[PDB]
Design a protein around this motif. Structure first.
Motif, PDB file in Angstrom:
ATOM      1  N   UNK A  14      37.530   6.542 -30.842  1.00 40.89           N
ATOM      2  CA  UNK A  14      38.974   6.708 -31.043  1.00 40.89           C
ATOM      3  C   UNK A  14      39.692   5.586 -30.297  1.00 40.89           C
ATOM      4  N   UNK A  15      39.776   4.382 -30.876  1.00 42.39           N
ATOM      5  CA  UNK A  15      40.445   3.275 -30.162  1.00 42.39           C
ATOM      6  C   UNK A  15      41.951   3.430 -30.063  1.00 42.39           C
ATOM      7  N   UNK A  16      42.618   3.614 -31.188  1.00 41.27           N
ATOM      8  CA  UNK A  16      44.032   3.927 -31.251  1.00 41.27           C
ATOM      9  C   UNK A  16      44.171   5.432 -31.430  1.00 41.27           C
ATOM     10  N   UNK A  17      45.344   6.009 -31.141  1.00 43.72           N
ATOM     11  CA  UNK A  17      45.513   7.458 -31.359  1.00 43.72           C
ATOM     12  C   UNK A  17      45.394   7.911 -32.806  1.00 43.72           C
ATOM     13  N   UNK A  18      45.517   7.012 -33.781  1.00 47.74           N
ATOM     14  CA  UNK A  18      45.582   7.453 -35.168  1.00 47.74           C
ATOM     15  C   UNK A  18      44.272   7.273 -35.938  1.00 47.74           C
ATOM     16  N   UNK A  19      43.348   6.442 -35.455  1.00 49.95           N
ATOM     17  CA  UNK A  19      42.201   6.007 -36.260  1.00 49.95           C
ATOM     18  C   UNK A  19      40.936   6.711 -35.778  1.00 49.95           C
ATOM     19  N   UNK A  20      40.662   7.899 -36.321  1.00 55.52           N
ATOM     20  CA  UNK A  20      39.574   8.754 -35.832  1.00 55.52           C
ATOM     21  C   UNK A  20      38.848   9.513 -36.948  1.00 55.52           C
ATOM     22  N   UNK A  21      38.472   8.837 -38.032  1.00 55.16           N
ATOM     23  CA  UNK A  21      38.053   9.507 -39.256  1.00 55.16           C
ATOM     24  C   UNK A  21      36.603   9.138 -39.556  1.00 55.16           C
ATOM     25  N   UNK A  22      35.798  10.096 -40.039  1.00 57.51           N
ATOM     26  CA  UNK A  22      34.347   9.910 -40.106  1.00 57.51           C
ATOM     27  C   UNK A  22      33.740  10.115 -41.486  1.00 57.51           C
ATOM     28  N   UNK A  23      32.637   9.385 -41.724  1.00 57.99           N
ATOM     29  CA  UNK A  23      31.683   9.481 -42.827  1.00 57.99           C
ATOM     30  C   UNK A  23      30.332   9.917 -42.292  1.00 57.99           C
ATOM     31  N   UNK A  24      29.813  11.054 -42.694  1.00 52.98           N
ATOM     32  CA  UNK A  24      28.526  11.508 -42.146  1.00 52.98           C
ATOM     33  C   UNK A  24      27.323  10.890 -42.843  1.00 52.98           C
ATOM     34  N   UNK A  25      26.115  11.314 -42.473  1.00 48.52           N
ATOM     35  CA  UNK A  25      24.908  10.782 -43.087  1.00 48.52           C
ATOM     36  C   UNK A  25      23.618  11.308 -42.487  1.00 48.52           C
ATOM     37  N   UNK A  26      22.524  11.267 -43.249  1.00 51.83           N
ATOM     38  CA  UNK A  26      21.258  11.851 -42.822  1.00 51.83           C
ATOM     39  C   UNK A  26      20.141  10.918 -43.269  1.00 51.83           C
ATOM     40  N   UNK A  27      19.235  10.571 -42.351  1.00 52.58           N
ATOM     41  CA  UNK A  27      18.405   9.385 -42.549  1.00 52.58           C
ATOM     42  C   UNK A  27      17.238   9.521 -43.532  1.00 52.58           C
ATOM     43  N   UNK A  28      16.242  10.434 -43.346  1.00 47.30           N
ATOM     44  CA  UNK A  28      15.044  10.279 -44.208  1.00 47.30           C
ATOM     45  C   UNK A  28      15.167  10.986 -45.556  1.00 47.30           C
ATOM     46  N   UNK A  29      16.039  10.458 -46.411  1.00 43.55           N
ATOM     47  CA  UNK A  29      16.266  10.997 -47.747  1.00 43.55           C
ATOM     48  C   UNK A  29      15.373  10.249 -48.726  1.00 43.55           C
ATOM     49  N   UNK A  30      14.347  10.924 -49.239  1.00 46.19           N
ATOM     50  CA  UNK A  30      13.472  10.325 -50.238  1.00 46.19           C
ATOM     51  C   UNK A  30      13.025  11.422 -51.192  1.00 46.19           C
ATOM     52  N   UNK A  31      12.947  11.079 -52.477  1.00 41.82           N
ATOM     53  CA  UNK A  31      12.517  12.000 -53.516  1.00 41.82           C
ATOM     54  C   UNK A  31      11.080  12.448 -53.284  1.00 41.82           C
ATOM     55  N   UNK A  32      10.762  13.632 -53.814  1.00 44.32           N
ATOM     56  CA  UNK A  32       9.420  14.194 -53.717  1.00 44.32           C
ATOM     57  C   UNK A  32       8.378  13.335 -54.428  1.00 44.32           C
ATOM     58  N   UNK A  33       8.785  12.598 -55.465  1.00 42.33           N
ATOM     59  CA  UNK A  33       7.843  11.768 -56.197  1.00 42.33           C
ATOM     60  C   UNK A  33       7.314  10.595 -55.393  1.00 42.33           C
ATOM     61  N   UNK A  34       8.160   9.989 -54.567  1.00 44.61           N
ATOM     62  CA  UNK A  34       7.796   8.788 -53.826  1.00 44.61           C
ATOM     63  C   UNK A  34       7.786   9.017 -52.316  1.00 44.61           C
ATOM     64  N   UNK A  35       7.216  10.138 -51.871  1.00 43.15           N
ATOM     65  CA  UNK A  35       7.074  10.381 -50.441  1.00 43.15           C
ATOM     66  C   UNK A  35       5.737   9.876 -49.915  1.00 43.15           C
ATOM     67  N   UNK A  36       4.653  10.126 -50.652  1.00 43.95           N
ATOM     68  CA  UNK A  36       3.325   9.716 -50.209  1.00 43.95           C
ATOM     69  C   UNK A  36       3.138   8.207 -50.292  1.00 43.95           C
ATOM     70  N   UNK A  37       3.857   7.543 -51.196  1.00 43.99           N
ATOM     71  CA  UNK A  37       3.836   6.091 -51.264  1.00 43.99           C
ATOM     72  C   UNK A  37       4.563   5.455 -50.094  1.00 43.99           C
ATOM     73  N   UNK A  38       5.393   6.215 -49.393  1.00 41.59           N
ATOM     74  CA  UNK A  38       6.277   5.686 -48.369  1.00 41.59           C
ATOM     75  C   UNK A  38       5.730   5.994 -46.982  1.00 41.59           C
ATOM     76  N   UNK A  39       6.032   5.114 -46.031  1.00 40.44           N
ATOM     77  CA  UNK A  39       5.650   5.288 -44.637  1.00 40.44           C
ATOM     78  C   UNK A  39       6.894   5.534 -43.794  1.00 40.44           C
TER      79      UNK A  39
END
Lengths: 433, 424, 146, 427, 145
Positions: free
Chosen positions: D258-283
């Motif tokens: 929160x640098x200025x009093x007005x600018x405090x807005x967020x975008x969330x996210x979650x890291x290991x998103x991979x389809x079931x088809x290409x999980x074993x191919x991935x490390x």
């Protein structure tokens, strides 16, 4: 003490120097893993307290596949594991790219290991650069290294072993370029750079040596028994010793004329030795026929201007000086007249060692006749002609001028070699008053 | 260590690239699952040039498959090795270009350029030290000549350093399977010559010829006719993944071979090619190579080397072997055919040797040879293009996009310039 | 006798293919040690290589090492079945059986070692890379005495 | 030890939070009877933070349900893990929202708010040391922003200096499912910006797309579309209760973003998103986990991050790693995307780690991003508001409810001021 | 032999999960001692832990009782495998004595380093030491057998 460091740069260095250390480690009782089951070895070894010796070496190149099999061979354990310097991307026979784009990322750590090796042991007297004029990483990358070691280490001596393109046998097409681009740097920042081609090694492996179908393994082994013989009395006792600092004052007439040959004359097959004895008076006659000179030039068209005779083994000093005076009488070997003394010998107490599983035969005599000549005058001028007809319409210039460097350095080559060709005719003339 | 990225685009280029990953993998040992079940240790230590490691001990090739129709790839899933590909690599459209350079470069290439170049960046900058970009296409149809021309127009700009290795199955001299393929070809080379690094040229009639004269097979099938062009393009790369006494990179074979910047079109070849009867009648050593490789029965283009002069010649050997035979034979073939080689080049031929041969074979070779006998191909292609263009025939589609008359006279103008400089 | 010579030659052919992949075997072991957080100790046993392969893994080259060790262990059982032996053949066979035992300490074993750095050879892998060639030599010596 | 407070109002926020308490139970190992059956003891040292301890070995939550309809509440008692919930939290009325902000806030808003705030006050003093707020609202709903901006505005004369988190399902201006929603939207931002602290902007449009492509599902339904924001916010509130290697709190976040009093807005996210088809191919390793979080199609915006540089970024890792991985993989993304991070932050990313993975994985992370790109969402809601408003539509209703045409004038007037600052510092 | 090794490995896996909850086990015992008004004496037997459990804390006490029951059953399986040797029979009798319901554990010391000096000496040092010591004797028994 009496020591030198060996730098293997380029594939023609690191493969030739691959084959030299097996003789060197079998020159002594060192089992090749690193230990030893006698202060001779320390000239080319930095001994550790554990008993392990360390070879004096560094292996610098831009290709990874040529250094890696040494790191997976049987000499990953003899060597200290991080002077095996290895780049990623290749210059690949381009002069401007092993010197100004890709080699420059690794230079400052090479000289660091040079300073690291030099400041452990006190008595440095020379360097053994293993390279050639036949590629990009053996030629252009080294052409910066030979002007690092000179201005920064003062007047230390420095010795090179570089092969030379034969008039008929040359693998690469651009090899007329990266030879003459190397030689702008050689004369001003060196003391010696010996010559050989690849073709004339094969002929001795056919005629004097019985074993046909020569790979590169047996071809490397012949230069392995020559640089052993230059350094034969540094590590061993001798009746008449030669060091390495005096080689630069008596083999070198003029400030540019320092390009001699070598001739390991007793090279002989295992069954050829059984029907001909190897007495000393016929040892020294094997030096002077044109068949056993390691460079494809005819000695009968030029004048010798010095010589040397490095012996080993069961050589009494009474046969040598008697066999010295008989070769003076002959007319098929002629000398220039401003050298009436001519000659130079060295005798030593140790027999040369044949490689086990090898193609030479056990003896107790040897000669390594290092000498210069006028005969390399024509060998220089032929490769100026191969340079000319490719530069007559600027054939392969788009791998050089596109690397950010002017065409004008190709003009300085013709300033170089023509001004360094008239000397073999100017001061190579008769006695004029 | 120095990875190169492999693409196949267009049904001509997709199919010949579809066969590579079964032959290259059995040159390394990867099963139809994707696992490693080899025999030797040396056949993994440079695996990453065509591969990405994955979790569990599985590797995966780096083919980025791209087309405009969904019909081509659904066979490629259903093929023998269709289960070892990353399923996000299959990128394809839904409406057909249909043998048009206008559609593959302007109409339907302006929309799916960005959904593919993002997959280009997602494989390129995420791996360590790049070395090249193997693209398989031709000049035959409209997609693989139009989409590959549009594709490499950016690859040489966001990645202006790397080596562009484009491929071409040049149309047959007698007839080919398109009626507008002069237009598909001379539009391609309008942007190929100034922008790529070096191009291979493959002839499809000489695919058929060298299986009947030399291999005597009675059933020449496209499954077998691509198995021979897979053996050559996997050879230029046989020293990146195997050691040898004198080894060859791709650029090391490019800086030596290429004389001039705009003349970079090649001619593959391959030495051991033995009929099923003649198996037991042929010896395997180097004098059975330099005669079987240097002859016109083995080259892969519509050229006349008796009417031309070779600029440069490359010959990559393979198998542990003794190379004075390589030196002294290719001294002699240089010295025999003194009028077959140009004279201002003093020495012409570059030798390269490997140490591990093809599987079950004692030894092999691979030929890549530059020639000044391919100008008549670019003369006859640009002649029969001018037969069609003179009455403005088949300008029904290219005028319809709004492309001017000035477009199609520049490709003919610059194909006068190239054929005037093979004469140079 | 002929069967055990054919088995030994088959194991030697597999070992030659494994030896060509020695750098991949070392890289496989190093990545497993990283995932195990076990970089401090040498790899001291066949069982430790198995544990790395099963929990921390590269898998193909580890399987090839395990398969060769399994075939060497089976070949020891075939030697025991061929004859009651002599003090020499029994001493050679017991050395083979000890070396191919799952939990035997290999940390000091040195023959393959020259392809390692001095640190890797001393402190990490010198034991495990030396196992197969030493056991093959004792099995050849056993056959030559038998 | 730092206990924390969860509420909800609206339709979606009353059901996304009905997917939260399923996730945290499985992180902790809590049965449907309320009996704990987790595996490791390293969580039991901090079981008090969300759950209240209950006598007999049972464990009980502390969330508060309040809305004006019975139906969406009665779904939760029909739910799988709606059986552990506390029964006197369920304060339900009788009236109809009508998707009206005029009746969630001013008309009916006097009555039940005084009857629910004192149950929060019956839980605020009960804990040991309170931390903050989780109010889970649809932005611009009848029960969504009718009770959202009202409830925390009246808190602030009791807790002036306390942290606050809210999960605001943003309207995503491409298309909306309510004709009066921009009227419901711009009065929420009227009263939040002087008061709100950290809102989590949740697009359903973005999560329609990333469940379609980077997950490759076949029938994404709301029983699983709420999951991908449900498991996201657990990573933020994990370093409170789990040990780490460089651990974090919510006030550690607030100083960072929160640098200025007005600018405090967020975008969330979650890291290991991979389809079931290409999980074993991935490390699953660190240098490829970092590529998923920073993909511009991965974070939950209905916007492109190309025009919008980032003020300050946070990322909370989980599982066991090394940190000069992360310390360099921080440093790399400033070097290449240097026109995507503003020059006026010296260290552009806060990096926090932990020690314990989620269930079913070896390691994970959670992405929390703050931009200069959200103003295109903030301009266009006003653009679909002012098109509805310049023609003076729907004014006599709110005038009958009390709200004049005078009030709607400051909303665009203040959003003239607020949306300027994401644009001013673009040079 | 294989079956008893698999049983022992299963008990070791349960004991690892129990050991991660050692602080919860101690807090469970302390609250039971408070309710029993029995803070003066060490916890000296498995039977005393059972009595405390009977008259989250209950779950960890059950896990301790289940491990002790499985160790006692594993002693019976060792007895059935062979008549043994003086060494294996001495190890088995030590295991049987230690897992007996009424055996005094008050002096037993292996888990002890996670206790304060007072807790280790006077309260729980016996009971926390039981399982790891019995597991060692069972491993030693297998290694001799």
């Amino acid at each position: 003490m009496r020591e030198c460091i060996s730098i293997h740069v380029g594939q023609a260095g690191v493969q030739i120097g691959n084959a030299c250390w097996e003789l060197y480690c079998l020159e002594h009782g060192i089992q090749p893993d690193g230990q030893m089951p006698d202060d001779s070895f320390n000239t080319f070894f930095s001994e550790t307290g554990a008993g392990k010796h360390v070879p004096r070496a560094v292996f610098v190149d831009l290709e990874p596949t040529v250094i890696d099999e040494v790191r997976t061979g049987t000499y990953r354990q003899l060597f200290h594991p991080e002077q095996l310097i290895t780049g990623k991307e290749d210059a690949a026979n381009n002069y401007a790219r092993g010197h100004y784009t890709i080699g420059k990322e690794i230079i400052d750590l090479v000289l660091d290991r040079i300073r690291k090796l030099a400041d452990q042991c006190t008595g440095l007297q020379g360097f053994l650069v293993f390279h050639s004029f036949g590629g990009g990483t053996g030629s252009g990358f080294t052409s910066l290294l030979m002007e690092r070691l000179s201005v920064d280490y003062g007047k230390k001596s420095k010795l090179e072993f570089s092969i030379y393109p034969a008039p008929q046998v040359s693998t690469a097409v651009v090899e007329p370029y990266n030879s003459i681009l190397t030689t702008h740097t050689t004369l001003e920042h060196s003391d010696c750079a010996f010559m050989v081609d690849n073709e004339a090694i094969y002929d001795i492996c056919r005629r004097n040596l019985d074993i046909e179908r020569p790979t590169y393994t047996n071809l490397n082994r012949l230069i392995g028994q020559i640089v052993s013989s230059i350094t034969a009395s540094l590590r061993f006792d001798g009746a008449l010793n030669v060091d390495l600092t005096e080689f630069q004052t008596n083999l070198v007439p003029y400030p540019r004329i320092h390009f001699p040959l070598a001739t390991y004359a007793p090279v002989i097959s295992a069954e050829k030795a059984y029907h001909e004895q190897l007495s000393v008076a016929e040892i020294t006659n094997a030096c002077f026929e044109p068949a056993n000179q390691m460079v494809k030039c005819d000695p009968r068209h030029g004048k010798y201007m010095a010589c040397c005779l490095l012996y080993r083994g069961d050589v009494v000093p009474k046969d040598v000086n008697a066999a010295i005076a008989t070769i003076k009488t002959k007319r098929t070997i002629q000398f220039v007249d401003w050298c009436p003394t001519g000659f130079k010998v060295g005798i030593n107490y140790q027999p040369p060692t044949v490689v086990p599983g090898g193609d030479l035969a056990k003896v107790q005599r040897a000669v390594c006749m290092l000498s210069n000549t006028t005969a390399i005058a024509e060998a220089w001028a032929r490769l100026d002609h191969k340079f000319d007809l490719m530069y007559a319409k600027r054939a392969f210039v788009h791998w050089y001028v596109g690397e950010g460097m002017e065409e004008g350095e190709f003009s300085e080559a013709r300033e170089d070699m023509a001004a360094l060709e008239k000397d073999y005719e100017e001061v190579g003339v008769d006695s004029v008053e | 260590m120095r990875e190169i990225v492999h693409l196949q685009a267009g049904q001509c280029g997709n199919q010949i690239g579809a066969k590579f990953w079964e032959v290259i993998s059995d040159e390394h040992g990867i099963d139809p699952t994707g696992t490693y079940h080899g025999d030797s240790d040396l056949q993994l230590e440079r695996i990453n040039v065509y591969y990405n490691e994955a979790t569990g001990g599985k590797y995966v090739p780096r083919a980025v498959l791209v087309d405009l129709e969904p019909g081509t790839m659904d066979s490629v899933r259903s093929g023998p090795f269709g289960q070892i590909f990353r399923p996000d690599n299959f990128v394809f459209g839904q409406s057909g270009a249909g043998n048009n350079w206008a559609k593959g470069h302007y109409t339907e290439g302006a929309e799916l350029v960005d959904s593919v170049l993002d997959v280009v960046r997602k494989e390129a900058e995420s791996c360590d030290c790049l070395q090249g970009f193997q693209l398989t296409h031709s000049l035959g149809g409209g997609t693989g000549s139009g989409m590959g021309t549009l594709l490499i127009s950016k690859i040489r700009e966001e990645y202006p350093d790397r080596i562009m290795n484009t491929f071409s199955v040049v149309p047959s001299p007698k007839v080919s399977d398109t009626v507008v393929e002069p237009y598909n070809a001379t539009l391609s080379v309008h942007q190929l010559v100034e922008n790529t690094d070096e191009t291979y040229c493959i002839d499809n009639e000489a695919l058929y010829d060298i299986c009947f004269r030399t291999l005597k097979l009675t059933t020449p099938t496209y499954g077998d006719l691509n198995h021979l062009v897979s053996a050559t393009m996997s050879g230029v790369t046989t020293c990146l993944r195997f050691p040898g006494q004198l080894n060859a990179d791709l650029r090391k074979l490019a800086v030596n071979m290429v004389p001039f910047p705009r003349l970079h079109f090649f001619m593959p070849g391959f030495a051991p090619l033995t009929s099923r009867g003649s198996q037991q009648y042929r010896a395997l050593t180097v004098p059975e190579l330099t005669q079987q490789m240097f002859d016109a029965k083995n080259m892969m283009a519509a050229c006349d080397p008796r009417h031309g002069r070779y600029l440069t010649v490359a010959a990559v050997f393979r198998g542990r072997m003794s190379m004075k035979e390589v030196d002294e034979q290719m001294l002699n073939v240089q010295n025999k055919n003194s009028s077959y080689f140009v004279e201002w080049i003093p020495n012409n031929v570059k030798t390269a040797v490997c140490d591990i041969p093809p599987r079950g074979l004692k030894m092999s070779a691979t030929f890549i040879g530059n020639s000044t006998a391919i100008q008549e191909l670019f003369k006859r292609i640009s002649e029969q293009f001018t037969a069609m263009f003179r009455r403005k025939a088949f300008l029904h589609w290219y005028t319809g996009e709004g492309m001017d008359e000035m477009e199609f006279t520049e490709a003919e103008s610059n194909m006068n310039d190239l054929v005037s400089e093979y004469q140079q | 006798m002929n069967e055990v010579k054919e088995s030994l030659r088959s194991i030697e052919q597999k070992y030659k293919l494994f030896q060509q992949q020695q750098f991949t075997f070392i890289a496989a072991l190093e990545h497993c040690r990283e995932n195990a957080h076990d970089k401090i100790r040498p790899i001291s046993s066949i069982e430790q290589v198995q544990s790395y392969m099963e929990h921390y893994c590269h898998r193909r080259i580890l399987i090839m090492f395990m398969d060769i060790c399994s075939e060497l262990s089976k070949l020891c059982q075939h030697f025991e079945a061929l004859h009651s032996g002599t003090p020499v053949t029994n001493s050679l066979l017991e050395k083979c059986k000890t070396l191919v035992s799952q939990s035997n300490d290999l940390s000091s074993l040195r023959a393959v070692v020259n392809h390692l750095s001095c640190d890797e050879a001393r402190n990490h892998y010198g034991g495990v890379v030396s196992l197969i060639p030493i056991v093959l030599d004792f099995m050849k010596e056993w056959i030559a005495h038998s």
